[PDB]
């Protein structure tokens with residue numbers, strides 16, 4: 001039981017990792033002037 | 043097609059570009075509708091545009107069918 | 114090299130120190146550019162400085178090439 | 185109301201300074217990456233163009249003082265005219281359109297770094313072994329920290345119902361992700377704590393999971 | 403709002419032919435008569451929120467007056483159906499010392515060509531009604547003009563900033579039951595969820 | 607937050623101070639999770655690396 | 658300061674509206690079950706009862 005639970009836990013960890021990175025990137029790359037705002041401020 | 047317009051002062055008789063064969067005019071009351079009267083916007087458009095609740099439109103398809111009310 | 118300057122009132126004909134052989138003047142409109150006109154800054158600099166968007170510069174390399182416009 | 189200065193020809197010159205408040209529609213849909221075009225419309229109140237011929241000369245920025253939250257793109261002007269039914273005479277006006285873009289160096293590293301760190305820590309729960317009774321502790325504490333972060337977030341955002349600001353969606357996505365992480369760890373925790381004599385694991389799930397694990401861990 | 407008063411002055415009349423080019427004149431506040439129209443239900447702390455512009459007169463004597471202002475009026479708000487609530491807040495205008503036999507008010511219609519939506523209220527309408535009130539002293543009636551601003555709230559903010567977190571918190575609270583007791587985390591989860599709700603009460 | 611300025615023209619010092627503190631604390635959490643993964647382990651299941 | 662209205666007999670009628678702030682002692686001992694008696698005292702500033 002425990003090995004199955006650990007590996008499914010790791011699989012879930014993955015799915016959330018990919019979902020999270022893709023979500024943050026897409027939402028902060030959607031803004032029309034976002035690319036210009038970082039080049040100026042940073 | 044020749045349509046009167048208001049973007050040129052004095053009021054002109056500009057000759058409309060192609061694709062737009064409807065002279066139109068749009069009139070509504072602003073604050074100064076007691077002394078000055080209703081506003082006037084003249085032009086030529088592809089098809090005559092939407093009439094808001096407070097706006098009136100009188101759309102023609104002939105030359106100089108949309109003059110200032112004085113005329 | 115002798116360059117006019119404005120840091121001295123009345124307008125002087127101060128003689129510039131070494132290393133700076135370009136008399137310059139810089140002129141722009143402030144608020145009072147309707148009655149007073151544009152501002153005037155005269156001096157001598159190493160090489161004539163940067164022109165901002167709203168500033169104009171007329172840079173010379175000769176004696177008394179940057180006088181007040183009246184003169 | 186300052187004084188009016190007159191020279192021998194009669195030319196008169198008038199500078200009323202002031203702190204002016206004008207009405208301009210703000211769009212916070214792309215917050216904080218948003219550019220605003222707020223205009224200022226000047227005109228006479230009782231005079232027409234045949235009695236007061238307004239002439240627009242250009243605006244002055246020699247005295248501009250940057251404030252640290254908005255960058256001034258420009259302030260161009262436009263003279264416009266409006267005709268009325270009463271007569272042929274036109275009524276002029278002068279409109280100056282202040283264009284400005286927000287500066288993100290503050291929100292970037294005071295609203296989006298803590299959120300990213302919190303989300304990462306929330307994802308961190310899965311690595312944690314179940315033997316340590318700390319997975320639920322970590323996940324729920326992270327959610328509580330996010331709840332606290334919402335206070336700063338609220339005091340810093342706009343309250344508009346005309347659109348959804350970007351970072352509102354960002355924080356909603358983060359919240360949903362954290363909550364579903366809590367749910368999933370509860371599930372697998374249900375698996376870890378189980379009595380073999382009481383029940384048996386399903387077949388299909390077992391074999392699929394075992395094959396995927398064996399391939400992933402080589 | 404910008405008010406709009408229009409009346410006729412008998413004493414401010416002239417012949418255009420005798421004054422070529424002078425088609426209008428303008429008079430400041432205290433140089434000619436203006437009516438005492440003002441908001442009965444004002445809560446401003448100066449009671450007249452208007453900016454006294456100039457009065458414009460043409461040869462017939464027709465006079466035209468626009469006092470703009472930021473007006474604060476008293477209106478009962480009902481928050482029983484918050485945030486799904488519609489408010490009917492009215493503005494009552496009338497003379498202060500004149501009757502209907504000395505100042506015959508006439509209500510013409512309101513103007514929305516300049517309306518600027520604000521993002522928290524949707525304007526249903528602003529209809530007007532002229533009404534009259536009689537008194538024991540005499541048969542003469544006292545008129546008034548009432549404009550009823552009707553507006554409904556916009557829920558896109560409270561919907562997904564006050565009701566999504568609450569639903570997620572409640573779901574997580576229900577989640578405790580699935581959790582096995584062997585894991586010493588059921589009380590932890592439940593009480594932490596209650597604490598998160600307590601914090602949410604601050605925004606709320 | 608209530609005590610600092612909200613400016614995007616520059617980064618106040620203590621903002622960097624608090625950022626560094628936050629990063630340090632978070633990485634401490636990560637590292638303790640790692641070594642915790644080590645402490646709770648089944649010997650029959652796996653072997654520790656050599657190097 | 659509104660205007661004063663006068664009829665042929667000389668009777669004069671005056672309505673100054675306003676947002677008035679007055680001093681009144683509040684007792685919060687029985688909060689929130691508390692009743693307050695806040696008073697407003699009006700009188701002339703330079704005239705007596707014989708004037």
Ligand SMILES: *[C@@H]1O[C@H](CO)[C@@H](O[C@@H]2O[C@H](CO)[C@@H](O[C@@H]3O[C@H](CO)[C@@H](O)[C@H](O[C@H]4O[C@H](CO)[C@@H](O)[C@H](O)[C@@H]4O)[C@@H]3O)[C@H](O)[C@H]2NC(C)=O)[C@H](O)[C@H]1NC(C)=O
Pocket residue numbers: 076077078111269460461462463464
């Ligand atoms: C001093 O100012 C006053 C008011 O500004 C002015 O009296 C007003 O003049 C206007 C314009 O002549 C009058 O409006 C007219 O009213 C009649 C009757 O209601 C209408 O039939 C007229 O119709 C015109 O406008 C229509 C708009 O759609 C057109 O479709 C139509 O073809 C006509 O062109 C017009 O609306 C107004 O009634 C008077 N009075 C008042 C109280 O407004 C007066 O003439 C000015 N004096 C001088 C010396 O200039």
Ligand SMILES: *[C@@H]1O[C@H](CO)[C@@H](O[C@@H]2O[C@H](CO)[C@@H](O[C@@H]3O[C@H](CO)[C@@H](O)[C@H](O[C@H]4O[C@H](CO)[C@@H](O)[C@H](O)[C@@H]4O)[C@@H]3O)[C@H](O)[C@H]2NC(C)=O)[C@H](O)[C@H]1NC(C)=O
Pocket residue numbers: 147148149182191192193194195
């Ligand atoms: C009372 O005040 C008015 C206004 O202050 C004044 O009339 C103005 O005088 C100025 C200066 O003479 C005028 O500006 C000139 O305009 C002409 C035509 O546009 C220009 O060619 C002139 O060029 C000068 O400035 C240039 C700036 O770069 C120089 O490069 C050039 O060499 C010239 O020196 C100059 O700009 C202005 O047009 C008038 N009128 C107005 C409305 O400003 C009037 O003279 C004063 N009366 C008395 C009795 O003093």
Ligand SMILES: *[C@@H]1O[C@H](CO)[C@@H](O)[C@H](O)[C@H]1NC(C)=O
Pocket residue numbers: 417419420
């Ligand atoms: C004054 O107006 C009348 C019409 O009302 C006109 O006959 C007369 O000519 C006008 N005055 C002059 C100086 O013409």
